[PDB]
């Protein structure tokens, strides 16, 4: 009824939209360093 709407609204991904309205795939890299020993670190070079 009135004053009762779903909090989720759909995105309009039309191909005719502008550059700023284009669908961009965004990946977030979150880094957290605690006192625990590290398991993933920098890579190793393979020079000639």
């Amino acid at each position, epitope marked *: 009824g*009135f*004053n009762c*709407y779903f909090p989720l*609204q759909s995105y*309009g*991904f*039309q191909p*005719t*939209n*502008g550059v*700023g*309205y284009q669908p961009y795939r965004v990946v977030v890299l979150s880094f957290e360093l605690l006192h625990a020993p590290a398991t993933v670190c920098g890579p190793k070079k393979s020079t000639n």
Partner: antibody
Amino acid sequence: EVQLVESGGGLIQPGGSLRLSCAASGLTVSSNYMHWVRQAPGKGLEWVSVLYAGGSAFYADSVKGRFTISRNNSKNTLYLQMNSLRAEDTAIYYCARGLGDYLDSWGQGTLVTVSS
Amino acid sequence: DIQMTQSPSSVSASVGDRVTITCRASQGIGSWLAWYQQKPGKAPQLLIYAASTLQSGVPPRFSGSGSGTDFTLTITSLQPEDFASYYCQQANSVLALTFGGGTKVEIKR
């Protein structure tokens, strides 16, 4: 079943501070998106500022500064404060509540005249 | 960033005519346009929203169909009561509204 009233309009100097008062009868002041649309006399409407349900607000490019929005949950009223005014600020504005990307509710308007 | 231009400004039509007001935007927007009707001396009111559906209280004479760039507010039956200005508004990602100029419909004389 909505009803919005406004008060505080009148004649004031450009070098002064003016506080508005927008009241909602069947609407809360912390649960909807509100827009302050101001329309010049003889011209079309123009966006000025927007406030969200939380503690966030936004302003346009021409009115980015000298603007403050502070809602009040005690008396269910909306307050807009204009610390600085210009000669082009005279117009008619309507406080309202709305959803995302569009607003449907509307309220009355108070005429303000600013001059020397 | 976005600017609003409306092709019609002052149009005259009879009772049995379509006003055919067109709305154009600088950048393509997909079905996020709403129309208004502000009478002189009266607070504005919404007519349609999202350019596809219709408000419950608004009579169903108003209609619109626009995909990305060209929008319209063709009316099947023009009534003497709804003689006011028309605006099409599009918002941004930060809820930045953008209202444009007024198109007025006057009775032929």
